[PDB]
Amino acid sequence: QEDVLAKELEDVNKWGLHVFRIAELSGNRPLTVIMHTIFQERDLLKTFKIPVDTLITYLMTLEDHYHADVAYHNNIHAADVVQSTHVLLSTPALAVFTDLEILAAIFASAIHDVDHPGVSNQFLINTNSELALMYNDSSVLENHHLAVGFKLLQEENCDIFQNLTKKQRQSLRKMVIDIVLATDMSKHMNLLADLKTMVETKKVTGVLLLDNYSDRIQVLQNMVHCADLSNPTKPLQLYRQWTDRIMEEFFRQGDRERERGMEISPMCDKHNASVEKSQVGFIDYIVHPLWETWADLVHPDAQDILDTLEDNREWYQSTIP
Amino acid sequence: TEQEDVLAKELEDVNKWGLHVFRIAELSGNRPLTVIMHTIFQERDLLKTFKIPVDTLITYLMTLEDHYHADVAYHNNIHAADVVQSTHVLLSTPALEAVFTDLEILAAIFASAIHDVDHPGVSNQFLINTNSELALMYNDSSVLENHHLAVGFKLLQEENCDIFQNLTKKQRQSLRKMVIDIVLATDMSKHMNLLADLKTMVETKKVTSSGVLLLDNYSDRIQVLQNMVHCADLSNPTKPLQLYRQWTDRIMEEFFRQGDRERERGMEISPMCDKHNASVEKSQVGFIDYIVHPLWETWADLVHPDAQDILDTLEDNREWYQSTIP
Ligand SMILES: CCOc1ccc(Cc2nccc3cc(OCC)c(OCC)cc23)cc1OCC
Ligand SMILES: CCOc1ccc(Cc2nccc3cc(OCC)c(OCC)cc23)cc1OCC
Ligand SMILES: [Mg+2]
Ligand SMILES: [Mg+2]
Ligand SMILES: [Zn+2]
Ligand SMILES: [Zn+2]
Contact A19/A227 with Cβ under 8 angstroms? no
**Residue B269 Rama label (left phi>0; alpha psi -120 to 50; beta):** beta
CA separation (Å) from B62 to B43, B55, B304?
19, 11, 37
Residue B247 CB–ligand 2 contact under 6 Å: yes
The CA-to-CA distance between both ends of chain B, in Å, stands at 48
Q: Which of A304, A248, A315, A227 is nearest to A279 (CA)?
A: A315
Contact B25/B78 with Cβ under 8 angstroms? yes
CA separation (Å) from B313 to B227, B235, B301, B309?
19, 11, 16, 6
How wide is the angle at C-alpha B230 spanned by C-alphas B228 and B233, nearest 5°? 115
Q: Which of B131, B153, B154 is nearest to B143 (CA)?
A: B131
Which of chain B's residues have a Cβ under 8 Å away from the Cβ of A134?
137, 150
Q: How far is CA A110 from the centre of its chain?
A: 8
Strand partners, B213: B207
Beta strands in chain B (DSSP E): none
**Contact (CB<8Å) B176/A135:** no
Question: How far does the CA of residue B180 sit from the closest CA of chain A (Å)?
Answer: 7
Strand partners, A204: A208
Q: Where are the domains of chain B?
A: 4-326
Which of chain A's residues have a Cβ under 8 Å away from the Cβ of B149?
136
CA separation (Å) from B304 to B95, B220, B222, B227?
8, 18, 20, 15
Q: Which of B125, B112, B118 is nearest to B185 (CA)?
A: B112
- CATH code of the domain made up of A2-321: 1.10.1300.10
Burial class (CB in 10 A: 0-12, 13-18, 19+), A227: buried
Residue bearing the CA closest to ligand 2, atom 3 = B188
Active site residue B75: yes
Residue B236 CB–ligand 2 contact under 6 Å: yes
Q: Phi then psi for A138, rounded to 5 degrees?
A: -110, 110
For ligand 3, a single-atom ion, which residues have Cβ within 5 Å?
Answer: A 113, 183
Which of chain B's residues have a Cβ under 8 Å away from the Cβ of A147?
136-139
Q: Which of B23, B22, B24, B63 is nearest to B40 (CA)?
A: B24
CA pair distance B199, B45, nearest whole angstrom:
33
Contacts of B46 (CB under 8 A, 6+ apart): B40, B52, B102, B105, B106, B109
Contact B235/B83 with Cβ under 8 angstroms? yes
Amino acid at A168: Q
Contact A228/A80 with Cβ under 8 angstroms? no
Q: What 3-state class would DSSP assign to B276?
A: coil
Amino acid at A167: K
CA pair distance B30, A220, nearest whole angstrom:
52
CA pair distance A299, A92, nearest whole angstrom:
10
CA pair distance A17, A268, nearest whole angstrom:
29
* CATH pick for B4-326 out of 3.30.540.10, 1.10.1300.10, 3.30.420.40, 1.10.1500.10: 1.10.1300.10
Q: Which of B111, B90, B113, B40 is nearest to B228 (CA)?
A: B90
Which ligand 2 atom is at minimum distance from the Cα of B247? 18
Contact B253/B209 with Cβ under 8 angstroms? no
Q: Which of A289, A83, A100 is nearest to A195 (CA)?
A: A289
Distance A145 CA to ligand 5 centre (A): 10
What DSSP element (H or E) covers A225? Answer: helix A213-228
Tallying the residues shown for chain B, one arrives at: 326
Neighbouring CB atoms inside 10 A of B277's CB total 6
Q: Which of A180, A228, A282 is nearest to A83 (CA)?
A: A228
Q: Which of A83, A67, A86 is nearest to A75 (CA)?
A: A67
Contact A248/A273 with Cβ under 8 angstroms? no
Q: Is the peptide bond before B120 cis (omega within 30 degrees of 0)?
A: no
> Which of B139, B150, B180 is nearest residue A146 as measured by Cβ atoms?
B139
The CA-to-CA distance between both ends of chain A, in Å, stands at 41
CA separation (Å) from A281 to A275, A284, A317, B120?
10, 5, 10, 49
